[PDB]
Write an enzyme that holds these catalytic residues in place. Structure first.
Site, PDB file in Angstrom:
ATOM      1  N   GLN A   1       0.824  -1.204   0.000  1.00 49.53           N
ATOM      2  CA  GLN A   1       0.000   0.000   0.000  1.00 49.53           C
ATOM      3  C   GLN A   1       0.858   1.254   0.000  1.00 49.53           C
ATOM      4  O   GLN A   1       0.603   2.196  -0.763  1.00 49.53           O
ATOM      5  CB  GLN A   1      -0.935   0.006   1.206  1.00 49.53           C
ATOM      6  CG  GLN A   1      -1.605   1.346   1.414  1.00 49.53           C
ATOM      7  CD  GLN A   1      -2.828   1.271   2.292  1.00 49.53           C
ATOM      8  OE1 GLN A   1      -3.209   0.201   2.760  1.00 49.53           O
ATOM      9  NE2 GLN A   1      -3.464   2.414   2.509  1.00 49.53           N
TER      10      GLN A   1
ATOM     11  N   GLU B   1      -3.916  -6.817  -1.962  1.00 50.74           N
ATOM     12  CA  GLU B   1      -5.296  -6.465  -1.683  1.00 50.74           C
ATOM     13  C   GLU B   1      -5.849  -5.676  -2.861  1.00 50.74           C
ATOM     14  O   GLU B   1      -5.155  -4.814  -3.413  1.00 50.74           O
ATOM     15  CB  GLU B   1      -5.414  -5.650  -0.388  1.00 50.74           C
ATOM     16  CG  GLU B   1      -6.483  -4.577  -0.417  1.00 50.74           C
ATOM     17  CD  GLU B   1      -6.617  -3.847   0.896  1.00 50.74           C
ATOM     18  OE1 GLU B   1      -5.900  -2.847   1.097  1.00 50.74           O
ATOM     19  OE2 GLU B   1      -7.450  -4.267   1.726  1.00 50.74           O
TER      20      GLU B   1
ATOM     21  N   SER C   1       7.547  -0.940   2.848  1.00 51.96           N
ATOM     22  CA  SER C   1       7.499  -0.688   4.276  1.00 51.96           C
ATOM     23  C   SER C   1       7.981  -1.919   5.029  1.00 51.96           C
ATOM     24  O   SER C   1       7.927  -3.044   4.527  1.00 51.96           O
ATOM     25  CB  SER C   1       6.080  -0.337   4.736  1.00 51.96           C
ATOM     26  OG  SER C   1       5.710   0.964   4.328  1.00 51.96           O
TER      27      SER C   1
ATOM     28  N   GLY D   1       2.695  -6.730   5.981  1.00 53.60           N
ATOM     29  CA  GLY D   1       3.067  -8.096   5.655  1.00 53.60           C
ATOM     30  C   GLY D   1       3.493  -8.262   4.212  1.00 53.60           C
ATOM     31  O   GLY D   1       4.485  -8.936   3.926  1.00 53.60           O
TER      32      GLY D   1
ATOM     33  N   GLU E   1      27.355   5.675  -8.695  1.00 57.18           N
ATOM     34  CA  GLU E   1      28.342   6.529  -8.040  1.00 57.18           C
ATOM     35  C   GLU E   1      28.011   6.723  -6.565  1.00 57.18           C
ATOM     36  O   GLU E   1      28.861   6.511  -5.688  1.00 57.18           O
ATOM     37  CB  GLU E   1      28.413   7.882  -8.746  1.00 57.18           C
ATOM     38  CG  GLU E   1      28.636   7.804 -10.244  1.00 57.18           C
ATOM     39  CD  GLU E   1      28.881   9.163 -10.865  1.00 57.18           C
ATOM     40  OE1 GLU E   1      28.897  10.165 -10.119  1.00 57.18           O
ATOM     41  OE2 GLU E   1      29.054   9.231 -12.099  1.00 57.18           O
TER      42      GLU E   1
HETATM   43  N1  LIG Z   1       4.740   7.349   4.423  1.00 59.22           N
HETATM   44  C1  LIG Z   1       3.793   6.465   4.135  1.00 59.22           C
HETATM   45  N2  LIG Z   1       3.670   5.309   4.880  1.00 59.22           N
HETATM   46  C2  LIG Z   1       2.698   4.414   4.589  1.00 59.22           C
HETATM   47  C3  LIG Z   1       1.825   4.656   3.544  1.00 59.22           C
HETATM   48  N3  LIG Z   1       0.968   3.621   3.465  1.00 59.22           N
HETATM   49  C4  LIG Z   1       1.277   2.732   4.431  1.00 59.22           C
HETATM   50  N4  LIG Z   1       2.341   3.210   5.143  1.00 59.22           N
HETATM   51  C5  LIG Z   1       2.993   2.533   6.274  1.00 59.22           C
HETATM   52  O1  LIG Z   1       3.080   1.148   6.002  1.00 59.22           O
HETATM   53  C6  LIG Z   1       2.920   0.395   7.186  1.00 59.22           C
HETATM   54  C7  LIG Z   1       2.155  -0.900   6.930  1.00 59.22           C
HETATM   55  O2  LIG Z   1       2.260  -1.319   5.588  1.00 59.22           O
HETATM   56  P1  LIG Z   1       1.115  -0.888   4.550  1.00 59.22           P
HETATM   57  O3  LIG Z   1       1.726  -0.206   3.354  1.00 59.22           O
HETATM   58  O4  LIG Z   1       0.151   0.027   5.256  1.00 59.22           O
HETATM   59  O5  LIG Z   1       0.339  -2.228   4.127  1.00 59.22           O
HETATM   60  P2  LIG Z   1       1.027  -3.285   3.138  1.00 59.22           P
HETATM   61  O6  LIG Z   1       2.415  -2.848   2.746  1.00 59.22           O
HETATM   62  O7  LIG Z   1       0.161  -3.484   1.922  1.00 59.22           O
HETATM   63  O8  LIG Z   1       1.084  -4.663   3.960  1.00 59.22           O
HETATM   64  P3  LIG Z   1      -0.263  -5.466   4.304  1.00 59.22           P
HETATM   65  O9  LIG Z   1      -1.273  -4.513   4.881  1.00 59.22           O
HETATM   66  O10 LIG Z   1       0.039  -6.570   5.287  1.00 59.22           O
HETATM   67  O11 LIG Z   1      -0.799  -6.057   3.025  1.00 59.22           O
HETATM   68  C8  LIG Z   1       2.154   1.280   8.148  1.00 59.22           C
HETATM   69  O12 LIG Z   1       2.824   1.325   9.384  1.00 59.22           O
HETATM   70  C9  LIG Z   1       2.142   2.658   7.525  1.00 59.22           C
HETATM   71  O13 LIG Z   1       2.689   3.597   8.415  1.00 59.22           O
HETATM   72  C10 LIG Z   1       1.945   5.812   2.796  1.00 59.22           C
HETATM   73  O14 LIG Z   1       1.171   6.025   1.869  1.00 59.22           O
HETATM   74  N5  LIG Z   1       2.933   6.719   3.093  1.00 59.22           N
HETATM   75 MG   LIG Z   2      -1.615  -4.173   3.225  1.00 67.59          MG
END
Ligand SMILES: Nc1nc2c(ncn2[C@@H]2O[C@H](COP(=O)(O)OP(=O)(O)OP(=O)(O)O)[C@@H](O)[C@H]2O)c(=O)[nH]1
Ligand SMILES: [Mg+2]
Ligand SMILES: Nc1nc2c(ncn2[C@@H]2O[C@H](COP(=O)(O)OP(=O)(O)O)[C@@H](O)[C@H]2O)c(=O)[nH]1
Lengths: 100, 50, 55, 116, 441, 439, 51
Positions: free
Chosen positions: E11, E71, E140, E144, E254
């Site tokens: 996400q 998702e 991130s 997961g 670099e």
């Molecule tokens: N800076 C920033 N952080 C994000 C964003 N979206 C999610 N996060 C961070 O990502 C962490 C969790 O991962 P997510 O991206 O939300 O969800 P995911 O990567 O799809 O993993 P799953 O939910 O298990 O499928 C959270 O702690 C959020 O703080 C975003 O658009 N910008």
């Molecule tokens: Mg997710």
């Protein structure tokens, strides 16, 4: 405990003076290298400059150990101070309707 | 009680070691800088006869 | 005045594991370097004794 | 099967310049000459004779799919420069733990550089 | 010829990709259809867009990106939004069910179904590219999908492409604020796997960006879009030297090479300057000395750790806009002549400087003011080690009672991997200690 | 895509699921015919999560209404949104249970179970990728407390990895309407703790108290109770139905909410509850939402969490907000009431945000909390069961169905061990390891 | 029962759940079993092949 924090900063201010002294001495030896080769012959005063360095390193140690014994006591002062207030609330808790 | 007894003995030494180590350092530099002047007098003295 | 200076708790199982990176040429240099490292631990800043000098 | 060399034109056929951005097949640089003619080593319908030796490897190639590859794939880049004596061993054991990845066509062939 | 292929996962990956790609289209002049504003000839140029886009038959441009998620709704939004006709349908890959904050699910069970499809799509994109410079990978450490599937994709990408750079934009857990409870487990297990399959990383936590946005941009209630814009600005300043000309251009390799001193120390910290609103901008000179002084403030790093708690080991520095090498050197000299900034001993000259001409563009509806000069910063320092120590703190005090581990075991991952990963992070922390030591014999 | 099959058992289940389907029909834009007359596109994008397609552009709910007495089914069918349900999904026996768990479980629920398993297999095979089942029942009855447990036990065997929620109505002890209520409650909680993923414990006395003191209604009927509960059930899966800034769903909540498989009982709550003058004087903001969410007079269970340690906490927010205010407020509430969260889990709070606000509202929020204070209900059930089962009172009804006597003994034993492990996790210390790290 | 010991004990002593091979075939999620599709070799290696 409150007295100790200022005794902590009092010694640390001196530790910069010990450190500043170590720069002053090493700065001087660099200037002692600027002299022409006729004057470059080592003398007694060069031994004194080396004598200053060993002391400041050793005086660094006593002030270093000065604070390490200061820290361990300072933490034990906190925990006793912590638990003392914690235990105070236990007996104060059944006098809550009283004047206290 | 124990930490209070421990504290007062400790605090005096920190103040006592503070002043002496301050006092010792200034003694190091004054004697050392005197010898550099002592080297200066001879080099000025020899310059006269030259 | 609050007096907080401590390391965050770690379990004793994961301790005593040797490092994976060995950079210094000789252990003779390593021991002297780490001995000098230990001594500044009351004057270093932050946590893990890795900061710059206090004051 | 084999990948020959275009000699003075081999610069045009190198794998990266053909936009194939991955490990690629090696090129035979020299060709040896045979004297005389050639014996028959197979029956009709390409059956090898009883006398002729055969290779002992797999007769269906060697691919390793996702559900067949190991769970911990070691890296290709192995650069043992600042590693400790045991740490270089442990990584090298991880390299050579799985021989089926190394013999696989899709499998990795890591290079090892330096020493502890 | 220059070519960066984007492998945004999760996400966070998809939303950051939305911000970055809107920025790229606005910069290059693309319209949301994917066309130049006129019926311009393909015999013309401005082929700079080739570093990101690819030309088609109709004179249309297709991004070199693969948004992946497990998702449906996050990618359905980009399928339905304004930029719907910009992205190729086959590039946006989704899955029916997600790992749901479970590295184990995202690594062994669910990720392994869509490994092959996304690998095939990346292979086709690399076929399209002529001279491939690198793979940019955004994810991130909490989620997961963006943990487990990103780790598995990295592991297989290392096999499929031995040499190429795999740059790592990562969302690090914040020291205090958290959107999850199980996220130390993910943030522990992914780094042990990606320690040996990674080239450089740029970990950012959202708390520090919250502080920066509330302190400098005068927005007391911003949203994840406002963070994504800043991240896109960082990536833009990274790839600017590839895209447009510069007085001293700098590739990806670099600043990969001059930032990683040892094979297990590949964790820089970003910094951007200036980030100030228009009302404040109307009042301040913005010069090279000012912006390079703002870059070294411990109240400006988007990682919640003070460099004054450690020592810098390397510094990549990227100036952009109306900048002059003489003033750059004067500013760096002033930075050098300061005791508050301390360097390691074996790095006497620890700077890698690049210069670009074109000022950064301004997206309407953004936050920042339009400024004629700017700077990005990528500093590798040992002040990150306290963050690893805090992560070990939280992981250990969860792992003592063996909490939440039934989920992972029931998924089908062994429990000894937890211990092994924690031990390797302990080893990494001790590595940071050893490289932080000074030697005086 | 990601489907939910809705199990509905007993009179409690039927009425509260009726209100539940009315609420989602109004949220997704469904007329009493069943067609869609909404205006926005997001209202019909993921409607397959709960609905199934029928000709004429019709949507039929994925619900199974099961009852042992036909009198409730008539009221459900003649209710306001009555004819939306497909008639074949109504499954009903001819003879009631009489608030007898043994009758509902062994003798008479054993005949309806085949047909209801047929219908739930119908609806599970319809969907491509089913997430799981959500069941609604009460523990003080005869069929939801009874044959409902049989349903749970069989479909846990048939579909293991799918998720199961249970919105269970537990007995309040202060007010009651059934003498044999403790027997059914204790013979049901054993099946719950053995075969269930998540359980939400809702209490009618708590709902009455909330309607008395918060919404200030002169006449609180059962409709408002069902409306509150159904708002909770909608707020659980709104993030599955609609997109948000930070998405989440049921498996995410379960994974981050259940530390060990035995502890899966949660206290739910809804944030924006106000009366006339309250609505006039109160500005709906994020800190006010968090404050009313964490007020213990807002909880809908019968357990004060100032008498227990908050194991883990979940908030699912609704509307378009700024995430800085959300995270700042949850950090504030974590730091302030420091003693009320267990210490061996940092950041005990899990957050989600969904963009679409609930209909009729600009912002909302939903709380799901696991705390140890929930054992206050099991202690009370165990005492009232001791007082009864001591003298073998009302026991002929249960033992005439053919069950033995050791079933009560083992049910009480398992319940007691559950609350024992709850207190062991209660008085647990963090900075300590032993007996497993001896290797 | 010392449940903190037992809950740890059940986790540490055990085995994983082996996942069955599944592959996705389309730009949207489409799970399919892998051992019957004909992608996995199966019949060629087993049996009296050629006899
Ligand atoms: N800076 C920033 N952080 C994000 C964003 N979206 C999610 N996060 C961070 O990502 C962490 C969790 O991962 P997510 O991206 O939300 O969800 P995911 O990567 O799809 O993993 P799953 O939910 O298990 O499928 C959270 O702690 C959020 O703080 C975003 O658009 N910008
Ligand atoms: Mg997710
Ligand atoms: N909250 C709530 N409780 C209800 C509702 N309907 C019945 N109850 C409670 O459920 C109990 C009776 O359930 P019962 O009809 O015996 O369940 P059944 O035998 O399985 O049909 C009573 O104590 C009621 O207070 C409802 O719509 N909402």
């Amino acid at each position: 405990l409150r007295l100790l924090l200022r005794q902590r900063e009092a010694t640390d201010r001196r530790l910069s003076e010990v450190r500043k002294g170590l720069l002053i001495n090493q700065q001087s030896v660099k200037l002692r290298g600027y002299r022409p080769k006729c004057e470059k012959i080592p003398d007694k005063a060069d031994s004194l400059l080396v004598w200053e360095k060993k002391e400041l390193k050793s005086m660094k140690r006593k002030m270093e150990k000065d604070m390490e014994i200061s820290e361990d006591l300072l933490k034990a002062l906190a925990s006793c101070r912590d638990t003392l207030d914690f235990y105070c609330q236990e007996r104060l808790q059944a006098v809550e309707l009283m004047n206290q | 009680k124990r930490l209070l007894m421990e504290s007062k003995d400790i605090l005096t030494e920190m103040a006592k070691n503070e002043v002496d180590i301050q006092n010792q350092q200034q003694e190091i530099s004054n004697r050392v800088c005197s010898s550099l002047a002592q080297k200066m007098r001879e080099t000025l003295e020899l310059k006269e006869r030259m | 005045p609050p007096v907080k200076l401590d390391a965050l708790w770690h379990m004793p199982h994961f301790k005593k594991v040797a490092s994976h990176l060995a950079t210094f040429p000789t252990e003779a240099d390593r021991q002297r370097a780490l001995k000098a490292h230990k001594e500044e631990y009351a004057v270093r800043q932050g946590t893990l004794r890795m900061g710059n000098y206090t004051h | 099967a084999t990948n020959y060399s275009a000699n003075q034109y081999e610069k045009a056929y190198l794998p990266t310049y053909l936009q194939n951005w991955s490990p690629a097949r090696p090129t035979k640089e020299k060709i040896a000459a045979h004297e005389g003619y050639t014996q028959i080593i197979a029956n009709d319908r390409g059956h090898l004779l009883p006398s002729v030796p055969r290779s002992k490897a797999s007769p269906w190639g060697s691919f390793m799919g996702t559900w067949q590859m190991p769970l911990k794939i070691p890296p290709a880049k192995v650069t043992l420069t600042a590693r400790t004596t045991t740490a270089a061993d442990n990584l090298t054991k991880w390299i050579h733990k799985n021989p089926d990845l190394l013999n696989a066509c899709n499998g990795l062939r890591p290079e090892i550089s330096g020493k502890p | 010829m220059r070519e960066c292929i984007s492998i945004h996962v999760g996400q966070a990956g998809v939303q950051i990709g939305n911000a970055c790609w809107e920025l790229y289209c606005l910069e290059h002049g693309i319209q949301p259809d994917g066309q130049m504003p006129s019926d311009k000839t393909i015999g013309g140029g401005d082929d700079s867009f080739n570093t990101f886009f690819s030309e088609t038959g109709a004179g249309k441009h297709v991004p070199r990106a693969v948004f992946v998620d497990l998702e449906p709704t996050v990618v359905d939004e980009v399928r339905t939004g304004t930029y719907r006709q910009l992205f190729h349908p086959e590039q946006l890959i989704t899955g029916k069910e997600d790992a749901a904050n479970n590295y184990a699910r995202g690594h062994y069970t669910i990720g392994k179904e869509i490994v092959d499809l996304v690998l095939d799509r990346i292979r086709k994109l690399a076929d399209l590219c002529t001279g491939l410079q690198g793979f940019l990978i955004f994810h991130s450490f909490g989620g997961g999908t963006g943990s487990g599937f990103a780790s598995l994709l990295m592991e297989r990408l290392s096999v499929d492409y031995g040499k190429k750079s795999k740059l790592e934009f990562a969302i690090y857990p914040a020291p205090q604020v958290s959107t999850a409870v199980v996220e130390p487990y993910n943030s522990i297990l992914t780094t042990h796997t990606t320690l040996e399959h990674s080239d450089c990383a740029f970990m950012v936590d959202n708390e520090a960006i919250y502080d920066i946005c509330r302190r400098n941009l005068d927005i007391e209630r911003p949203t994840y879009t406002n963070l994504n814009r800043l991240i896109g600005q960082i990536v833009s300043s990274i790839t600017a030297s590839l895209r447009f000309d510069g007085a001293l251009n700098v590739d990806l390799t670099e600043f990969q090479t001059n930032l990683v001193p040892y094979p297990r120390i590949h964790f820089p910290l970003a910094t951007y300057a200036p980030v100030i609103s228009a009302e404040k901008a109307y009042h301040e000179q913005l010069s090279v000395a000012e912006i390079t002084n703002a870059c070294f403030e411990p109240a400006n790093q988007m990682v919640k750790c003070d460099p004054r708690h450690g020592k810098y080991m390397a510094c990549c520095m990227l100036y952009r806009g109306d900048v002059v090498p003489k003033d750059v050197n004067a500013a760096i000299a002033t930075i050098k002549t300061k005791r508050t900034i301390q360097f390691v001993d074996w790095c006497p000259t620890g700077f890698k400087v690049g210069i670009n001409y074109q000022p950064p563009t301004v997206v309407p509806g953004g936050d920042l003011a339009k400024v004629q000069r700017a700077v990005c910063m990528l500093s590798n320092t040992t002040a990150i080690a306290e963050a690893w120590a805090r992560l070990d703190h939280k992981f250990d005090l969860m792992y003592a009672k063996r909490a939440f581990v039934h989920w992972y075991v029931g998924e089908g991952m062994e429990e000894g991997e937890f211990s092994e990963a924690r031990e390797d992070l302990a080893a990494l922390e001790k590595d940071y200690e050893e490289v932080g030591v000074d030697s005086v014999e | 895509m990601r489907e939910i099959v809705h199990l509905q058992a007993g009179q409690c289940g039927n009425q509260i699921g009726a209100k539940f389907w009315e609420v989602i029909s109004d949220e997704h834009g469904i007329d009493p015919t069943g067609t869609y007359h909404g205006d926005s596109d997001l209202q019909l994008e993921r409607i397959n999560v709960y609905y199934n397609e029928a000709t004429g552009g019709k949507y039929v709910p994925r619900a199974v209404l099961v009852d042992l007495e036909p009198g409730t089914m008539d009221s459900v069918r003649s209710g306001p949104f009555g004819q939306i349900f497909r008639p074949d999904n109504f499954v009903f026996g001819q003879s009631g249970a009489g608030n007898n768990w043994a009758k509902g479980h062994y003798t008479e629920g054993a005949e309806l179970v085949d047909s209801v398993l047929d219908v739930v297999r119908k609806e599970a095979e319809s969907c491509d990728c089913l997430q799981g089942f959500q069941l609604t029942h009460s523990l003080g009855g005869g069929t939801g407390s009874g044959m409902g447990t049989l349903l749970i036990s069989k479909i846990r065997e048939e579909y293991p990895d799918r998720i199961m929620n249970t919105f269970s109505v537990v007995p309040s002890p202060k007010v009651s309407d059934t003498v044999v209520e403790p027997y059914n409650a204790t013979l049901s909680v054993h099946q719950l703790v053995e075969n269930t993923d998540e359980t939400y414990c809702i209490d009618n006395e708590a709902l009455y108290d909330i309607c008395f003191r918060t919404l200030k209604l002169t006449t609180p009927t059962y409709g408002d109770l069902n409306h509150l509960v159904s708002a909770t059930m909608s707020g659980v899966t709104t993030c599955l139905r609609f997109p948000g800034q930070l998405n989440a769903d049921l498996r995410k909540l379960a994974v981050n909410m259940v530390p060990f498989p035995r502890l899966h009982f949660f206290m739910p709550g809804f944030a924006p509850l106000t009366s006339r003058g309250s609505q006039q004087y109160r500005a709906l903001t994020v800190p006010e939402l968090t404050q009313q969410m964490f007020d213990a007079k807002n909880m809908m269970a019968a357990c004060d969490p100032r008498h227990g340690r908050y194991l883990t906490v979940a908030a699912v927010f609704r509307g378009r907000m700024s995430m800085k205010e959300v995270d700042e407020q949850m950090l504030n509430v974590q730091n302030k009431n420091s003693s009320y969260f267990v210490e061996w889990i940092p950041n005990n709070v899990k957050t989600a945000v969904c963009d679409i606000p609930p209909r009729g509202l600009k912002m909302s929020a939903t709380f799901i909390g696991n705390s140890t204070a929930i054992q206050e209900l099991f202690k009370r059930i165990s005492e009232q069961f001791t007082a009864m089962f001591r003298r073998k009172a009302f026991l002929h009804w249960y033992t005439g169905e053919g069950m033995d006597e050791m079933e009560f003994t083992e049910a009480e034993s398992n319940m007691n061990d559950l609350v024992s492990e709850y207190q062991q996790y209660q008085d647990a210390t963090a900075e300590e390891e032993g007996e497993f790290e001896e290797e | 029962k010392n449940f903190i010991n037992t809950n740890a004990a059940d986790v540490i002593m055990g085995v994983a759940k082996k996942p069955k091979p599944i592959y996705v075939d389309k730009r949207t999620g489409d799970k399919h079993d892998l051992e019957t599709s004909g992608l996995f070799p199966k019949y060629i290696n087993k049996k009296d092949y050629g006899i």
